Amino acid sequence: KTSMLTKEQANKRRQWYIVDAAGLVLGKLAVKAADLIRGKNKVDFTPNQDCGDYLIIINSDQVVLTGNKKENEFWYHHSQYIGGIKKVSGRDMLKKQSDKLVYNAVKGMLPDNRLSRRWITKVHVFKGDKHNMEAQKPTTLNWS
Amino acid sequence: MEIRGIFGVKVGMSQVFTTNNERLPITVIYCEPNQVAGVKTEAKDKYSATLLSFDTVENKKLNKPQQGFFEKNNLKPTKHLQEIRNMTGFEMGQQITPQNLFQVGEYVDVSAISKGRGFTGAIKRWNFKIGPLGHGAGYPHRFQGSVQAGRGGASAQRVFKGKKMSGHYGHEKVTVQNLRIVGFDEANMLVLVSGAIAGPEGGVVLIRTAKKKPGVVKPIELAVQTEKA
Ligand SMILES: [Mg+2]
Numbered sequence: 001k002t003s004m005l006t007k008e009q010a011n012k013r014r015q016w017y018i019v020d021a022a023g024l025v026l027g028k029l030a031v032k033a034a035d036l037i038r039g040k041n042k043v044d045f046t047p048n049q050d051c052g053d054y055l056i057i058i059n060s061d062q063v064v065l066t067g068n069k070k071e072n073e074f075w076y077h078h079s080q081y082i083g084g085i086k087k088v089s090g091r092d093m094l095k096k097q098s099d100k101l102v103y104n105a106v107k108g109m110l111p112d113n114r115l116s117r118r119w120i121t122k123v124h125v126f127k128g129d130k131h132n133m134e135a136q137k138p139t140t141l142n143w144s
Numbered sequence: 145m146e147i148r149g150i151f152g153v154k155v156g157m158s159q160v161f162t163t164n165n166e167r168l169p170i171t172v173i174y175c176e177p178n179q180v181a182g183v184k185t186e187a188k189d190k191y192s193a194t195l196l197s198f199d200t201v202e203n204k205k206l207n208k209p210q211q212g213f214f215e216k217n218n219l220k221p222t223k224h225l226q227e228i229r230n231m232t233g234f235e236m237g238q239q240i241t242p243q244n245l246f247q248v249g250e251y252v253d254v255s256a257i258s259k260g261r262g263f264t265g266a267i268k269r270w271n272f273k274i275g276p277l278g279h280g281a282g283y284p285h286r287f288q289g290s291v292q293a294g295r296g297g298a299s300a301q302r303v304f305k306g307k308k309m310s311g312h313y314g315h316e317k318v319t320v321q322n323l324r325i326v327g328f329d330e331a332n333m334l335v336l337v338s339g340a341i342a343g344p345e346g347g348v349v350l351i352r353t354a355k356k357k358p359g360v361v362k363p364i365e366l367a368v369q370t371e372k373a
Pocket residue numbers: none
């Protein structure tokens with residue numbers, strides 16, 4: 001037998017953050033956001049305690065998709081009815097709803113799980129620079 | 145746009161004769177002067193609308209939070225408050241009558257809570273057809289057809305969301321558009337609308353400026369009698 005591995009439990013302390021998503025791309029931003037939310041980079045990562053930090057993403061509509069994807073790759077959403085496919089294009093997503101784009105691109109990178117739906121709510125994606133979350137005193141770091 | 149609106153109580157239905165040699169059915173709507181109870185501006189509240197209070201009641205027959213709201217806002221107490229989107233050209237604390245909103249013969253639309261028709265079956269509800277009665281067609285012959293979508297795991301194996309089966313019908317809001325206004329009566333605070341208005345005799349009836357034909361008016365006169373003896 002052996003010494004039991006150490007595992008923090010309800011010993012969580014989470015600090016907010018700010019990243020200005022000015023000219024980043026979608027997916028490269030999304031993996032960094034997903035890891036920051038899960039606390040995958042924490043030195044003491046307990047796989048079942050939501051040991052990860054909060055996150056606020058600013059200037060969502062300025063994010064960019066490489067290549068001609070803006071006219072060729074579609075995002076779908078289906079109601080449970082028939083003929084309910086709503087099919088929108090990257091150019092239309094970067095204009096009509098941009099925060100929903102980053103939100104969905106982040107959520108899919110989390111595991112099918114019971115904290116995933118509780119992790120994803122720690123991502124606040126404002127479309128423009130201004131916000132009402134200055135009260136929480138976030139730090140600020142570039143490209144994460 | 146510059147949507148205009150007013151409320152009343154539908155009092156019944158009759159007919160009146162016009163020039164152009166035509167008989168015109170009519171609904172009669174009792175419209176007590178209303179009272180703007182709040183105005184929402186675009187910048188302040190992210191949209192625009194006007195909140196109207198009506199069906200004045202005694203202060204006793206009124207809940208305390210509402211009567212407090214009325215006393216603080218300097219109004220007459222009213223049983224009902226509801227609001228109209230995109231009504232702009234009005235201020236606070238003002239009485240509004242239908243004469244001040246609609247031309248003599250122009251186009252309005254009417255919303256009203258329809259007539260509650262009970263738990264009704266599919267064939268009256270969705271205008272379905274009735275299975276034949278001759279040749280002995282078996283006792284379930286008043287049904288919604290076959291609800292089938294696919295037999296066997298490959299095809300569909302369920303009933304489709306938003307099917308058409310029996311249920312509750314009536315007592316739901318509906319609206320008839322492009323119904324012209326015939327005339328008014330300032331003595332009784334009463335208005336005349338063409339056509340047939342949804343809702344039972346005595347319900348609450350909202351009139352708005354028709355979206356299909358916003359400003360369109362075509363005048364229609366009456367048919368004063370000239371036969372006496
Ligand atoms: Mg038999």
